[model samples]
Target: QFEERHLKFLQQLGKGNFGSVEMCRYDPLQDNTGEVVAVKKLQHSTEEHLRDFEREIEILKSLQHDNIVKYKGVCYSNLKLIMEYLPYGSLRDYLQKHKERIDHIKLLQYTSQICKGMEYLGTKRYIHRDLATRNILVENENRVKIGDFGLTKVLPQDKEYYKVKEPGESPIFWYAPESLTESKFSVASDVWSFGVVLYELFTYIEKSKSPPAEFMRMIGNDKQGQMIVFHLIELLKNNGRLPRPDGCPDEIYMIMTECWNNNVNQRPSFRDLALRVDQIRDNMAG
Candidate 1:
């Protein structure tokens, strides 16, 4: 267990609704140099946020994969969650900052790792309701770590999908049709959202800050959430999907479209995606 007294705050990492995540050093040995960790501090003691935060901790504890961020432990005294620090920050921030330097092969490499992580979760029957580039952290090397468990859910016993009792405001842009309209989450739905993240990668390479209007027009920040979601659902039902990013390999775009396949039955499994991305990665090599 990590304790407040044993941690030395290094820097502020992210400030969210509940609290801030800080970069800290776990110096139990009283040595100046210690293991770097990201600690989540609950600035808001609201009952609702606390339960949600604790739920996230439980989910993270259950999940263990190299491609996913490693949960260190907890600081019970101050209610801080300790996790391994990824110096490169989030994949979204990295792409934005180093847009000019990321090559086609690098994009494939990042997506490949996400496929592996999502595969592990799928095999464990876990659904990451929020799957987007912004939620994926970046390691210093050519690697990625899955982050954010605030919206993750476990499938019911022997069930392929988890139905939400009440769906709230969500990132509609990253949601699949069934998830947006029916409030159902499953590995297939996650694959659809991963398709959106795929678009994020290829588009960022082209330097297009945002994708097509159809993909982002719904969440204009202020509106009836129901109306926005319904509109996008209609658009998606009418064969709406992101176009292939310019300069992207045609073969890669094919996989992205398959991920967004209208029939959930037709979408590729994360296992299939894992192998496909590796095959694509090899083909993409110069």
Candidate 2:
């Protein structure tokens, strides 16, 4: 069992609606010998919130892979989760800061790691409802780890999509058309978000950022800005089109295009994505 005595809080890393994450040092003994970790402290946790937290913990504890964030332990009394400390922050932030320096080789390497992580999750029958570059973390040597499981779900064997009883607002740009319209989530839907992540990598746009100014301007704000954007997004999605980012490799862009296909059945599995990205990396290496 984990206790407060085992951890020494260092500084705040991030904050969200449910909780805040803090950088911590595991201090099992009074001695300074300790490893760095990230501690997520859940705030005002209700029964429902606790249940979800427990679920996330259960799923994370079972996942052990180089590309997935390692689960350290949990502080049950305070509703806190301890996880591996990633010093380099998120993939999205890293790309935004180093876009000019990122070469095709680096891009392929990072993307391949992401695919491997997603493939591991798929094998575990876990669906990461919110899969985006921002949700992925980076470490020294550019090692990538998939993190942030706030909306993750376990897929039933027979279900094609996990229908939300009460769907909340999701990132429209990252969501598949079916997910946006029907609250449907699945491995294929996650593949859709992967495509958006590829676009982010190629264009150096943070997932949180708004659409390109030209595209936003075209969707003029006659109604509420939110509603207007949604309406325009639906229109474009219905027409089976997504704006292509400038200067992406033809082969890579083709993969992303397939991922964003309107038909869920047409999207490549994460395993396929991993193989394709690995091949690209090998070609670049040669």
Candidate 3:
């Protein structure tokens, strides 16, 4: 941890439920190219929210992977956690930037990286409760790192799943049917979230990256809460899933749908999907 006085906040990068991330520079500037950083400052002063903020920092510090965001350090005096600054922005931004030329083969490469990161988290018993393209950060065309650990949980060794009931709000559109109803998050639920990300990646056809508003409309005028999750559940249960993205292959889409299987046990494990995506990427490369 470093002193808060060391960082000179440049500007706000983005904001989320817990806090805002601001671009900053280290005062010493010892290394000409290494002083830049991002600070996720805790905005809410509540004790519970502060605990969540600190938990995210703890989890981030334990994670070490190219596909996971780099954690620099933290300044606890005011609850600002420092991290690497990836200027390319989120995965959605990357898709929008190259939508005209990024072929399915190239997109597979990004998916493979995310699968590996998720697989790593699984091995560490961490469930990224919110897994979406919106939380994926891109450093370059060759690399992307998973971010936003506010909802992430470390699975108990004694239990197969972690039950979360102290609710704020769930990512209704990205959650699995089981997660919405049971409020239990496990590897399988994260897999479902990952599948939704695939939907986002494949469906971006040079258009604004919006949640499937077309499908989300069924729960309109009821943004009230988890009812939206329940309604989105019922809306999808008897109804068909989101339509296949333009030019998406049955092969890739088949794997995508498997993640949404009604039986959580039926969905492939991150360990399995890691190799699966690796193979899927090569299928396109060759």
- Model 1 misses residue 235 by how many Å? 0.3
What TM-score does structure 3 among the candidates reach?
0.91
lDDT tens readout by residue for model 3, 75-131: 866688889999888888778877888888778888888998998998889999888
Candidates ranked by lDDT: 1, 3, 2
Colliding residue pairs in candidate 2? none
Model 2 stretches astray by more than 4 angstroms: 165-169, 206-218, 221-226, 229-233
Candidate 1 residues lying further than 4 Å off, grouped into runs, are: 17-19, 29-31, 165-168, 205-226
Minimum summed lDDT over a 10-residue window in model 2 is located at 206-215
Put down candidate 1 lDDT per residue, 1-286, tens digits, no spaces: 8767889988998875567889999998887768999988778687877887887788898888989999888998747788989999989889988888998788888888999999888887889988888779998758898977767888889789999844344677777788776778899999998988888888883443454354555335454645766767887899877778767788888888999987888999888887888887787674
Report lDDT per candidate.
0.81, 0.80, 0.81
Clashing pairs in 3: none
| Candidate 3, run of 10 with poorest lDDT | 205-214
- At residue 193, candidate 2 shows an lDDT of 88
The all-Cα superposition gives candidate 1 an RMSD in Å to the true structure of 2.7
Ranking by TM-score: 3, 2, 1
Model 3, residue 67: distance off in Å is 0.4
lDDT per residue (tens digit) for residues 75-100 in model 2: 86557888999998888788888888
